[PDB]
Amino acid sequence: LWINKPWVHSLLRICAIISVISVCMNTPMTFEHYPPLQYVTFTLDTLLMFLYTAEMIAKMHIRGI
């Protein structure tokens, strides 16, 4: 349906790459270097978690648990 767009899956893949980058940018030394990076990765993780939870609950609305 709306969440099964041909390009929305590419958006999800790009989001996964962004999540990989963010988790690669989560170190005590990196945060000490740039606490702004700490805030940025927190916000990115929050957005990605929101999107992935939404798509998971939408997907499970059709297929059984």
Side-chain angles (χ1 to χ4, degrees), residues 1 3-62 64-65:
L1 237 183
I3 69 170
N4 292 336
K5 294 177 179 58
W7 61 270
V8 74
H9 297 2
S10 64
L11 177 57
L12 300 185
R13 298 184 300 103
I14 296 180
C15 289
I17 298 300
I18 293 179
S19 178
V20 171
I21 297 179
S22 174
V23 75
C24 291
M25 297 184 305
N26 180 278
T27 96
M29 283 298 303
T30 309
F31 289 170
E32 181 174 352
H33 284 5
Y34 323 97
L37 282 193
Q38 172 187 15
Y39 288 99
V40 162
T41 185
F42 164 73
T43 302
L44 290 181
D45 292 2
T46 300
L47 175 60
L48 294 159
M49 201 285 301
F50 192 13
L51 179 61
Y52 276 127
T53 302
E55 58 84 16
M56 182 187 66
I57 64 177
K59 180 169 300 179
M60 75 175 184
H61 260 78
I62 307 302
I65 298 180

